[PDB]
Amino acid sequence: MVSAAEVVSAQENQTYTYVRCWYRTSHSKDDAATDWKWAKNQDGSDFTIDGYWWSSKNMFYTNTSQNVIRQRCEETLDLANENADITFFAADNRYSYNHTIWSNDAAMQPDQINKVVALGDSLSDTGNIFNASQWRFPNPNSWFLGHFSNGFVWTEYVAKAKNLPLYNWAVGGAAGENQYIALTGVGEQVSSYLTYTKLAKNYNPANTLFTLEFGLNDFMNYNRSVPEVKADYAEALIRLTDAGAKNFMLMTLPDATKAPQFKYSTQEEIETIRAKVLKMNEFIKAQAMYYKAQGYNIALFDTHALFEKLTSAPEEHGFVNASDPCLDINRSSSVDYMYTHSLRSECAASGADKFVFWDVTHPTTATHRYVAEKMLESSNNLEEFRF
Ligand SMILES: CCCCC/C=C\C/C=C\C/C=C\C/C=C\CCCC(=O)O
Numbered sequence: 001m002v003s004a005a006e007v008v009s010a011q012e013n014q015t016y017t018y019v020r021c022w023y024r025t026s027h028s029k030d031d032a033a034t035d036w037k038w039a040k041n042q043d044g045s046d047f048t049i050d051g052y053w054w055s056s057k058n059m060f061y062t063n064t065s066q067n068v069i070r071q072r073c074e075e076t077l078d079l080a081n082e083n084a085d086i087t088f089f090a091a092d093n094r095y096s097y098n099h100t101i102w103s104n105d106a107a108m109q110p111d112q113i114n115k116v117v118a119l120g121d122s123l124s125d126t127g128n129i130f131n132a133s134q135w136r137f138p139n140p141n142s143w144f145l146g147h148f149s150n151g152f153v154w155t156e157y158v159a160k161a162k163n164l165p166l167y168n169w170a171v172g173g174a175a176g177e178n179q180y181i182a183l184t185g186v187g188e189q190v191s192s193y194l195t196y197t198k199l200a201k202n203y204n205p206a207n208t209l210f211t212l213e214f215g216l217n218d219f220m221n222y223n224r225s226v227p228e229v230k231a232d233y234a235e236a237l238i239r240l241t242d243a244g245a246k247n248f249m250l251m252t253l254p255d256a257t258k259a260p261q262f263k264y265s266t267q268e269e270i271e272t273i274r275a276k277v278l279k280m281n282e283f284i285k286a287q288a289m290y291y292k293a294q295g296y297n298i299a300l301f302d303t304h305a306l307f308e309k310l311t312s313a314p315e316e317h318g319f320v321n322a323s324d325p326c327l328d329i330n331r332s333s334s335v336d337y338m339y340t341h342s343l344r345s346e347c348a349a350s351g352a353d354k355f356v357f358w359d360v361t362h363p364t365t366a367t368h369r370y371v372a373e374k375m376l377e378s379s380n381n382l383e384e385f386r387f
């Protein structure tokens, strides 16, 4: 994907950069607003990281571990907030965009999972559209720093439970994301992953836990046929396994037609999408069995079955409401992502942790956490994966 000569030249172009530490300003997850500070050392001097830049979206590659960078942000911010939900990025100055930091692995690494790589849509996106929108979409007062929720997504909860770095290629389409970036498809995501990892040092793909949730963007936003979505899903698994991937967290798709935005869709539109989701889920199960029979490490979670339980009896799963958004949005219009919204009366009363949905499409961070924990329980804190 990148010649060996190009890799050497890039890796030898050594420099330094600074770290932007982001945090939730409120102690409540009802408030999505965030702010940032530069990372500092204990003596008050600026914290810097050594490494090299590369772009095919600039990634900064450093020898400094994600834990060390995280620790510097925690100490700099010195918040007594359990909901601080700290994230960090590389940045040369005040004008810089939020650049992902890749921590290079050691040459003598043990045979165990040491990072999470995510592929998918808005259900896994951690801010891929936010630099492209000049930090204006989704509005950072009502959506958590480029996440289409009031906090972390399921992949971040999974990565945190295992104390692992998470590197994200996921980006959706239900919020008008394609008015900001092109190349959002799963094949474009796998291509981008393959290109950027050639620049990494001592990269062993066998030590990566891959997460993949794909198909809802295609069925909801692009009216794509079931065979073309099945073919793209099979193609992603073929390309990843041929490039050394051994470990996957696969999942069935929740019935997206249960989301508040479908209150404003016709019955014909709803039945079309629902039928496509059901056919796709049978194919996802067949694909998981196919790779499991070949000796790959596959964890399959039935998110569809869990979501049916959650929406039919929310009171049995820690929720008061599964039909309305927490935010006071009572229509389906992508322009609403540009504005600040108040919480509806019922959600302000119960708290955002008691609602399944945050906006007309996306789940709350409590729903993301519930799914992530059910996943770890199902797989016995991921038993067929070596940690
Ligand atoms: C696979 C992990 C799921 C964790 C969240 C739990 C339940 C699903 C939540 C909501 C209902 C389903 C779909 C609508 C949500 C996002 C839009 C995805 C497509 C896009 O972005 O265009």
Ligand SMILES: [Mg+2]
Pocket: 228, 231, 232, 235
């Ligand atoms: Mg195809």
